[PDB]
Structures are given as structure tokens and as C-alpha cells.
């Protein structure tokens, strides 16, 4: 009994319903499960690559190709590029077809529900913006695939190191190519993302030589970014922004003074709960169906 996911958090008082929901419990449990899975490992870790993972990468490559086929247009506005709406319309019409390439035929009934999260994972057409809510929708998308058994426990490392990693590459391409606005202050973690800082800091726990203080060292980032998701995010920032790190990324600057990656990871998880998952402007757009339901969490 699959259900097309719909919005359920309509006003601020509804946040209580969200925090008590099955969806919330399942979502954060998924994030933390992937977090444990990647602990201490480099991106070059030798993991299983299942058929489903390959199809998910192919899916992202299709989105990538569409960007190439949909160049920015000349326009007066100094914010988001209107060609994004052309790209999004293609994804909007093709999302179910794309998801059907990943989901086995006997689970075709789940495709429309799962596809909704894909449609919510790539930014907002109207505002031409992207935020942690879209990133969360992608995690939700992957969570749904685990729930219906398309992705298995053995795929959890590949989910982060291969699929989510590729997703971030495509999102960065969207953000740069279409000049997308951040959807969301001096204490904001990042313009666009959050999850890669959590899973990335997990990779670096008990690292033999890299400490959090090293991520504001351009040399350290340049020499190590290929192995570490956290450092790849920093590299993106230092390419997108000018001047002293403390000026353009104050929250991350202060995080570099945390003595251990272990505490960075713990703190980022607390920040994620408070600044993403308990933030009404983000959660109001979360969609709930059968796989991630709004009903109170079961015991």
C-alpha cells in the first residue's frame, strides 16, 4: 500500500508531530547508520558495488547530461539562471522513468512514491535555490530504497561513498552552472549542504595525522580531498568564496578549533538536529507517504 508522499507540517505547532513521527525516527536512524558505516574509511575504500548502486549512479549521470544539454541563458537577473526551470521540467517529467530503472519490476507500485523524493532532491524551480531540505530529500529517497529492499545492508557504504558522493558532484554543477541561491547567517554551516560534513567527519575519526584544525589549511585540503568528503566540501567553499576563511565561513572556522574529529562528528549531529531537522522553514516542505509516514513512531 504505497502512498504518494505529501506535506504534513503546515504550521509551527506541527513541529511536535514531526519530532514524534515514524518518519523522523527512521530518517535520523538512517543518517546515523550510514554515519557509523563510513567511520574511519577513505573514499577509496574497496566496497561492494551492487546493480542498484550502478543504476543510481547512471541515474545521476543522466541528470548530469541534462545539465550539459541545457546551458545557462543570457538574462538580466544576477541571481538564479532561468535555464534551471528548463532542466527541472525535464527531471519532473522523467523522475518516475528514472526511478523505474533502479527499482525491480515487481516493486513497480513503489516507483511513484519513491520518485517524489527524487523530485524534491534537486532544488526549487520557482526560487532557483537549493538548501539542506533538498539534500534531506535525497537521503529520504535513498532511505526509501533501503526500506523496500532495493538497497541492502551491504550497500550502505556505497550509498555514501559512491551514490551520495556523485550526487554532491551533480548538485555542485547545478549550483555553479545555474547560479543557484542558498535556500536558507553568521552561524550557518554551509551555503548548500550539511550531510557530507557529518559523514565526512566520521571518515576522519582517529585519522593518523589530520585534525580538524587542518581543514582550513589549503595544502592539507589539496593533498587529501580525494579521500575525504569533508575536505571536498571545504575545497568547494574555498573555490566559491574569496578572502579569509574566518570571514566567509565563520561557523566552519570555529569548528576547526574542535580538537577531535570525533567531537566534530558529535557536534555536527546535534547541529543538524537543531538547524535542519528542527527548523520549520525546512521541515514544512518534508513529504510523508507510506515509507516515511507522519504517524507517531511505533515502539
Amino acid at each position: 500500500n504505497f502512498i504518494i508522499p505529501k506535506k504534513e507540517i503546515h504550521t509551527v505547532p506541527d513541529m511536535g508531530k514531526w519530532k514524534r513521527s515514524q518518519a523522523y525516527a527512521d530518517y535520523i536512524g538512517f543518517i546515523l547508520t550510514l554515519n557509523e558505516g563510513v567511520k574511519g574509511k577513505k573514499l577509496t575504500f574497496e566496497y561492494r558495488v551492487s546493480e542498484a548502486i550502478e543504476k543510481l549512479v547512471a541515474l545521476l549521470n543522466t541528470l548530469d547530461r541534462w545539465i550539459d544539454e541545457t546551458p545557462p541563458v543570457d538574462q538580466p537577473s544576477r541571481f538564479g539562471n532561468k535555464a534551471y526551470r528548463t532542466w527541472y521540467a525535464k527531471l519532473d517529467e522523467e523522475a518516475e522513468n528514472l526511478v523505474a530503472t533502479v527499482v525491480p519490476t515487481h516493486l513497480a507500485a513503489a516507483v511513484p512514491e519513491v520518485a517524489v523524493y527524487l523530485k524534491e532532491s534537486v532544488g526549487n524551480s520557482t526560487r532557483i535555490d537549493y538548501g539542506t531540505g533538498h539534500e534531506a530529500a535525497f537521503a529520504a529517497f535513498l532511505c526509501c530504497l533501503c526500506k523496500i529492499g532495493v538497497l541492502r545492508v551491504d550497500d550502505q557504504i556505497a550509498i555514501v561513498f559512491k551514490v551520495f558522493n556523485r550526487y554532491l558532484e551533480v548538485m555542485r554543477k547545478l549550483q555553479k552552472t545555474y547560479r543557484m541561491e542558498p535556500a536558507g547567517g553568521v552561524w550557518g554551516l554551509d551555503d548548500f549542504q550539511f550531510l557530507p560534513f557529518i559523514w565526512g567527519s566520521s571518515q576522519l575519526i582517529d585519522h593518523p595525522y589530520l585534525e580538524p584544525r587542518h581543514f582550513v589549511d589549503e595544502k592539507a585540503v589539496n593533498e587529501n580531498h580525494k579521500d575525504y568528503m569533508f575536505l571536498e566540501c571545504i575545497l568547494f567553499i574555498t573555490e566559491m568564496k574569496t578572502g579569509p576563511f574566518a570571514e566567509h565561513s565563520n561557523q566552519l572556522w570555529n569548528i576547526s578549533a574542535v580538537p577531535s574529529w570525533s567531537k566534530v562528528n558529535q557536534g555536527l549531529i546535534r547541529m543538524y538536529k537543531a538547524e535542519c531537522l528542527e527548523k520549520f522553514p525546512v521541515i514544512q516542505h518534508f513529504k510523508f507517504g507510506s515509507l516515511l509516514p507522519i504517524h507517531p513512531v511505533t515502539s
Binding site: V258, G267, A274
Partner: peptide, 5 residues
């Protein structure tokens, strides 16, 4: 500013 205590 206080998530890392």
C-alpha cells in the same frame, strides 16, 4: 556557537 561542548 554552542553545539560542540
Amino acid at each position: 556557537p554552542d553545539y560542540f561542548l
